[PDB]
């Protein structure tokens, strides 16, 4: 008996930016991509969010493998895993046994209804064929009233007379899978767990630091920003970096467009697997939105009308859309 | 080229209790099962481990669904709101009997033979009797002075002349799935997430409080224990409550024996699904070990020799064992 608003009505009640009263989006410092063939891993250490790392060790530490430090047999563990993490980081960074690569890109962007079109640097968007499209999905489930969000709501309409921009990034830590296997071959499960956890921390730190670098320098829509790492975790900054597959746009296949547009694989070695997971696994990607009114949200469950409309926009079958949007189908 | 000890050698270097000098196992206050048709949900609130609850809300709160409280759209505010909402929902659902808890505890004479634990009838002389059930063990085998653990190491050998015992439990919070669907039907995703999170918290609280009751009262091997809930989370008490499928014995099919022996489904309504998950989902089960020196551990990866021996002991095919123990096979199929 769950109620869903028909797509046309959800669109009429979409999030309204009031573009007539909006300031002009800032043009990024370049259009196209910038590639990082290496990155300063020591600098990233300061951006690490240690909570998920301690979560890993709480989970694994309850059932220690043979060969764990003696402290796991006590009635202390957090300090020991933290110190061991720092020793490993020092050794692996200095020996260059871990390395990071990434890419950032920016393009002119404008919205048409639920979708975001990107254009060539020198193009007049109204006069030009888009070079890429990032498709949006819109909230539909029922519960003035709150708007029905879609990521396209955060980008200026094609006909608004306002030029907008969209960015993207992909980052990864390389060497993790190889080191973990080597540790395991040596019978050292503790170090394997450790390097896997650290790889994840480094990739996320890279995403965080690079986002700050994008806000202040590369896009520079907030050049005066001066926030601590703790404030970054709390999302005290403006703009968002949502990745395909996450609740704001659950369609993983949007990664294909990111990879094509920014030539990500040939630029960074970061691959998309058949399930559209990133390889190496210690990797993060996303689209950058600069509007200070942008926010994360969950699309939530959607109706058949939106699935059909989305299929037509992407030129794929309903069955194909239903494969990738399975968990958010609001119908049988 | 990862090294594994042959099974016979891993067994020779198993954890050795030295049973003559250790405190003798205490006979529980009953043999067989005790069923809880209802349980004091309010009492369980004090035993809640809130960390995983706050983790759920950190994850969901980043991407709020339409209809969430207005604070999710702001710049401490979220944690405050979800916690007060949690306590309000707990109070309302408990008082209105819209959630209810059921469970069962059982105890039986138990003795080990090598890697396995046999259970016996109350009046049986274990050396003279056919076991009424067997809980099979798996032993650490991967190489690195430390022993190679198996759960059976925590139970007195059949021929030690020392009588031992094993317990088990299964508990669940009923009503969670139904309330969640009802909330969702109205379009209230916030409350659906909340009740699911609370159901999980209550089931885990029931497991914790019941284990304490087992240690102090029902088994009563630690009748003089008095630990606060924070110390319970730190595993400051003695004895363990490992469940089939967890790293100490990754074979989920051992749940079938638990369910058969203690007549769990008919006693409590808690079922095992085709995948051997518990239904309802807000549920916890395990085996109770009372030994002062029992501890959780990960079996880790095992060799073909142990897979073949385990299959022989359980009277099942090697193919089936390799299916159930897939993740811990230390060799290629």
Swiss-Prot record, chain A:
Location relative to the cell: Cytoplasm
Annotated tissue distribution: Widely expressed. Expressed at the highest levels in pancreas, heart, brain, skeletal muscle and placenta. Expressed at lower levels in lung, liver and kidney.
Illness the protein is tied to: Homocystinuria-megaloblastic anemia, cblG type: An autosomal recessive inborn error of metabolism resulting from defects in the cobalamin-dependent pathway that converts homocysteine to methionine. It causes delayed psychomotor development, megaloblastic anemia, homocystinuria, and hypomethioninemia. Neural tube defects, folate-sensitive: The most common NTDs are open spina bifida (myelomeningocele) and anencephaly.
Subunit and interaction comment: Monomer. Dimer. Forms a multiprotein complex with MMACHC, MMADHC and MTRR.
Domain text: Modular enzyme with four functionally distinct domains. The isolated Hcy-binding domain catalyzes methyl transfer from free methylcobalamin to homocysteine. The Hcy-binding domain in association with the pterin-binding domain catalyzes the methylation of cob(I)alamin by methyltetrahydrofolate and the methylation of homocysteine. The B12-binding domain binds the cofactor. The AdoMet activation domain binds S-adenosyl-L-methionine. Under aerobic conditions cob(I)alamin can be converted to inactive cob(II)alamin.
Protein family according to the UniProt entry: Belongs to the vitamin-B12 dependent methionine synthase family.
Function: Catalyzes the transfer of a methyl group from methylcob(III)alamin (MeCbl) to homocysteine, yielding enzyme-bound cob(I)alamin and methionine in the cytosol. MeCbl is an active form of cobalamin (vitamin B12) used as a cofactor for methionine biosynthesis. Cob(I)alamin form is regenerated to MeCbl by a transfer of a methyl group from 5-methyltetrahydrofolate.
The protein's name: Methionine synthase
Taxon lineage: Eukaryota, Metazoa, Chordata, Craniata, Vertebrata
């Amino acid at each position: 008996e769950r109620r869903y608003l028909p797509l046309s009505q959800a669109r009429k009640s979409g999030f309204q930016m009031d573009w007539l009263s909006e300031p002009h989006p800032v043009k990024p410092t370049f259009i196209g991509t910038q590639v990082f063939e290496e990155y300063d891993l020591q600098k990233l250490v300061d951006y690490i969010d240690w909570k998920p790392f301690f979560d890993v060790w709480q989970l694994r530490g309850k059932y220690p493998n043979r060969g764990f430090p003696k402290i796991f047999n006590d009635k202390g563990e957090a300090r020991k895993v933290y110190d061991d993490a720092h020793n490993m980081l020092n050794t692996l960074i200095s020996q260059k046994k871990l390395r990071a690569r990434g890419v950032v890109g920016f393009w002119p962007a404008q919205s048409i209804q639920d979708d975001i079109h990107l254009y060539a640097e020198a193009a007049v968007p109204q006069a030009a064929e888009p070079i890429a499209t990032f498709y949006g999905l819109r909230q539909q489930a029922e519960n003035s009233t709150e708007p029905y969000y879609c990521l396209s709501d955060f980008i200026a309409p094609l006909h608004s007379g306002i030029r907008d921009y969209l960015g993207l990034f992909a980052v990864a830590c390389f060497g993790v899978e190889e080191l973990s296997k080597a540790y395991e071959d040596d019978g050292d499960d503790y170090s394997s767990i450790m390097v896997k956890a650290l790889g994840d921390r480094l990739a996320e730190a890279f995403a965080e630091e690079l986002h700050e670098r994008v806000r202040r320098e590369l896009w520079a829509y907030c050049g005066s920003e001066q926030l601590d790492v703790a404030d970054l975790r709390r999302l005290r900054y403006k703009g968002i970096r949502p990745a395909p597959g996450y609740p704001s746009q659950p369609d993983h296949t949007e990664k294909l467009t990111m990879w094509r547009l920014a030539d990500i694989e040939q630029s960074t070695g970061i691959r998309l697997t058949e399930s559209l997971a990133m390889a190496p696994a210690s990797a993060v990607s996303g689209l950058y939105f600069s509007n200070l009114k942008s926010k994360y949200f969950a699309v939530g469950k959607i109706s058949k009308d939106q699935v059909e409309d989305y299929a037509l926009r992407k030129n794929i079958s309903v069955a194909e859309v239903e494969k990738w949007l399975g968990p958010i189908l609001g119908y049988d």
